[PDB]
Amino acid sequence: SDIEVGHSMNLTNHFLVAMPSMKDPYFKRSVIYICEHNQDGAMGLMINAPIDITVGGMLKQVDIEPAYPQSHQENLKKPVFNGGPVSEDRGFILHRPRDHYESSMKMTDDIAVTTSKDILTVLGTEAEPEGYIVALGYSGWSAGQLEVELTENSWLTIEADPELIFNTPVHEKWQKAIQKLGISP
Numbered sequence: 001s002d003i004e005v006g007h008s009m010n011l012t013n014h015f016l017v018a019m020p021s022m023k024d025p026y027f028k029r030s031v032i033y034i035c036e037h038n039q040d041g042a043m044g045l046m047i048n049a050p051i052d053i054t055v056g057g058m059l060k061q062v063d064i065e066p067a068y069p070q071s072h073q074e075n076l077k078k079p080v081f082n083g084g085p086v087s088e089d090r091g092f093i094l095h096r097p098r099d100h101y102e103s104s105m106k107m108t109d110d111i112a113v114t115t116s117k118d119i120l121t122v123l124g125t126e127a128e129p130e131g132y133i134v135a136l137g138y139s140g141w142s143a144g145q146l147e148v149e150l151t152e153n154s155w156l157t158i159e160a161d162p163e164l165i166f167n168t169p170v171h172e173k174w175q176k177a178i179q180k181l182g183i184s185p
Helices: 055-061 117-122 145-151 162-166 170-180
Strands: 014-018 031-038 041-046 050-054 079-082 086-095 104-106 112-114 132-142 155-159
Touching: 014 170, 031 170, 041 079, 041 145, 050 055, 055 079, 055 132, 086 117, 132 145, 132 162, 145 155, 155 170, 162 170
Parallel strands: 079 132
Antiparallel strands: 014 031, 014 155, 031 041, 041 132, 050 079, 086 112, 086 132, 104 112
């Protein structure tokens, strides 16, 4: 009774699945990997909103001189993603843990977020992650707006896993998500 624990929930390393009754059209049928979730708001990365720029595209744009020969070339043609409306000029790399990068936050043995530029010099090369998403800008929620929108029937949530982020056709991520929640597309 004096011993509190709070039912809590903590949505980090969790996917937010847009629900049919979703408002912000921006998020209509979005799947969001939640990175941070403290008492000062939330930070997530959309994982299925691809944009008009390719990985090699922004690599050339940001003008990053590659460390090793870029032998891959196929994945270098893949799309870059819009991670959210906030800080669209910033890049976030959601990937499978491989080598050590300066600014990086490991989430699981299979998912991590790197924000240092050092990682860009291995993209297209054989030193790149075995699965990564290049996202510009991120999704943000103030103090407890997350909780609210949740109880507002706006989203559904499932624990995140790597296969949905790196091994699932972009335009298929959503459908396969709500699937795990029972609801059918």
